[PDB]
Amino acid sequence: ADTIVAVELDSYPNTDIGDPSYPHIGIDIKSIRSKSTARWNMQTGKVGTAHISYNSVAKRLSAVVSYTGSSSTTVSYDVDLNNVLPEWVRVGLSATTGLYKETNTILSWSFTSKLKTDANSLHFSFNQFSQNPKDLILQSDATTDSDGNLELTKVSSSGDPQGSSVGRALFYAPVHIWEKSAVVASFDATFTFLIKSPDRDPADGITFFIANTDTSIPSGSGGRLLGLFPDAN
Amino acid sequence: ADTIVAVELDSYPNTDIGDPSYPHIGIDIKSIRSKSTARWNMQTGKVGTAHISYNSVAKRLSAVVSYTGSSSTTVSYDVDLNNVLPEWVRVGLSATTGLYKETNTILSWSFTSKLKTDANSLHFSFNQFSQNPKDLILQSDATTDSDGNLELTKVSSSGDPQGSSVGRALFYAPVHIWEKSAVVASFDATFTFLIKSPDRDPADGITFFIANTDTSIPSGSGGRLLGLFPDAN
Amino acid sequence: ADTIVAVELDSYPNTDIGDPSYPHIGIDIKSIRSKSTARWNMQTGKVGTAHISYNSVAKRLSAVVSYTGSSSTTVSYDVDLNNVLPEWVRVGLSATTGLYKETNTILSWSFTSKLKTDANSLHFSFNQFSQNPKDLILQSDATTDSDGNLELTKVSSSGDPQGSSVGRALFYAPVHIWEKSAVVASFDATFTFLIKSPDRDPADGITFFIANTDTSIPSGSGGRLLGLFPDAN
Amino acid sequence: ADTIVAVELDSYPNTDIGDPSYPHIGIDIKSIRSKSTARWNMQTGKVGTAHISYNSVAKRLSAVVSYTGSSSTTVSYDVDLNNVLPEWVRVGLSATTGLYKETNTILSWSFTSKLKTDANSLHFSFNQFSQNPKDLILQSDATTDSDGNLELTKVSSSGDPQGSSVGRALFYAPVHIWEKSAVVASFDATFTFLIKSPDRDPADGITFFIANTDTSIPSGSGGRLLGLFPDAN
Ligand SMILES: [Mn+2]
Ligand SMILES: [Mn+2]
Ligand SMILES: [Mn+2]
Ligand SMILES: [Mn+2]
Ligand SMILES: [Mn+2]
Ligand SMILES: [Mn+2]
Ligand SMILES: [Mn+2]
Ligand SMILES: [Mn+2]
Ligand SMILES: [Mn+2]
Ligand SMILES: [Mn+2]
Ligand SMILES: [Mn+2]
Ligand SMILES: [Mn+2]
Known part of the structure; x- marks a missing residue:
């Protein structure tokens, strides 16, 4: 299986599998x-x-989600990512839909990682995406539309989101997030998204994740599993 | 008085004022x-x-000090800097010497701050310093030598460090580290230093600090007070 | 007088002083x-x-002005800026109005300069401006409005531009654009603007400029002189 | 064949094929x-x-080569790279040796490309290289040594350069250097190198180049052809 670290924007509460009721x-x-x-x-x-x-150094993974003129949502977790992730990784975006749907549009995405022992670094940013982006590995249904937006999950020609869809987009170049005796390593990522839906309760969510460089959509990783894990363990 | 936040490289243990015995x-x-x-x-x-x-977001100030081919020293403290520092600040480097001395040479210094509500930012980096640097506010004895290094504390023509000296160097442009309803603000700084000394027990240390934009060397802030505070409270 | 280098967005053709008829x-x-x-x-x-x-190295000052979904305007001039500008400078934005008017709103402005001999650098960017920006030197009428925009020239409470106005905004920190024996030095700047006007023929224009660090609005530098020069020589 | 644009550091004068006599x-x-x-x-x-x-905008490819405490070498050529290169490319370093040899060591390499229509960008920098770098496509003999240096051409265990060798290193992720109606696109690259040799007349050189994303070492592209071209036309 893959090794995955992720920040999930979980839109549907699957209380049965640990999810909060909101x-x-x-x-x-x-x-x-x-x-x-x-x-x-x-x-x-x-x-x-x-x-x-x-x-x-701080070993604290943080994330904040906001919308213009309205309070933000934040979440942090103290953890030494060197214990979890391998030295070389690929970073990406994933999203899914199940019985209930929603669009999972990505309008922009930037990422920066630095490894000091000087200081090697990788930085990329898309303010728009081109169809057939050669610097992205599109998995599942994920595709780029004519507007320059990244649609992680299927969206009808009418723009209507489809259920039971899954997709991911990984940056092409692997990233060296750590090495033995490195003094400090850091990464920062930002993305803007647009989730629309006709459903009273849209699902399932969007994530930014980091995994082994050969990561792929696990068998039956749709719906509540945000296309990252094979099961719910 | 000033409002100060700092990372101190305390070379001399002043156990009397809370300092550890090392x-x-x-x-x-x-x-x-x-x-x-x-x-x-x-x-x-x-x-x-x-x-x-x-x-x-993470609200964890961290710092790591290292030397080629040798383990590093790290320190962190959880704190929301928005509660301590004012919205506009100046960042700088300070250093002192008392009875015991040491050179407090700065070879390079870089700094980056970002404020998102987009994303305003300020970044500067010196790999060398010129004498009479117009983008630095030199306080106390601090000066730039002919080699392009920043000497925070006095150093004789022979290169010998002098005791009872104090100096600071602030970047010229004030920095807007925060604003109401900002989504996230961050800053990162790096500097390389060279501390030499003929003393068996060199003193007193070097710091990177952030303070009110009109900050200045407090009265009698020499020695163990690293040129940042008026007293030891 | 000052030493000035600038890219002018000349909205009104003053054919009498060399300006093209458009x-x-x-x-x-x-x-x-x-x-x-x-x-x-x-x-x-x-x-x-x-x-x-x-x-x-290339010694070619270039500039391009564009608007969404429409062709761009470009202009270049081969010149070794080290022959014109002093080693330390301040960069800024200027704008004016004369008999005829127009708004000269600046929505964002970023700048980057690098000097290699390594590589010293300065970079700043504003996606919005705060009233009373401490990292900007506002000259003349220039001010920041409640929307976070920089109004180089006077604009009535109704938003109506006023004639015979002049203003400039300089970044606070001086910039070291060159030094003897430097290997290569470069700078890049971008700004977005909004020029509105009730006049059939709006005036006078907006510029990005670089000048001596103590530069100021020259006596009678209004109108066709874009607030940069004392005369038209 | 491939489409190639390059800056060559030609160490051996092959006057027969247009090369200057130095x-x-x-x-x-x-x-x-x-x-x-x-x-x-x-x-x-x-x-x-x-x-x-x-x-x-300026459409002027420039390059400067220098060594500490000594004058630099510069070269420029006016050309619209959009006429030569395809929209998606891969950037890299190449080097060769023929009858006469030299080491072609790369100690660091950084690259930045920006495409505005906002502004997509890619930036990477290595201050050191790891053996088996997953974000580099090593071609020919090119390899990374235990010191963290990139050896484009063969170097004996004793550190002695070998003749008749060729190698290239491409960054893994393709780069989108241009698109229709883009407002401005730019790229900047820097690398430090170490050429050593026991030969009175070392050969053959090192280059930074940009080519089609599937570029490869052309048949018999060794020696005076710097591993970029199949012939000398
Ligand atoms: Mn970098
Ligand atoms: Mn950040
Ligand atoms: Mn419901
Ligand atoms: Mn920035
Ligand atoms: Mn950092
Ligand atoms: Mn002792
Ligand atoms: Mn920089
Ligand atoms: Mn540019
Ligand atoms: Mn008219
Ligand atoms: Mn970028
Ligand atoms: Mn450059
Ligand atoms: Mn010879």
């Missing part, structure tokens, strides 16, 4: 069962912004 | 009495590197 | 009489974007 | 026969630095 954002460390979660006042229909940051 | 690095929040300290295996004579980072 | 953008080197100009298809009422770049 | 750096546009060259006061044994920059 939309939320959480930090997942090798398990869909978030190590930490926080109430997310979902603004279906409005453009949101997610910011994720971490550094090997 | 060289150390610490985080000071409006008091020379560090809120958190860690043992610093001082490498007198070798070039060291300090890295300081913080973001408004 | 709105234009030009590169000015110590003279309002541009060394090079190009036809500017002014989009009064729409948000424009200006990008200015230069490096000591 | 070591030189040049800009090659789809031909080993440089469109522009300049005398290179080669400092065999000392660490050199190369800086390459270009932007779609």
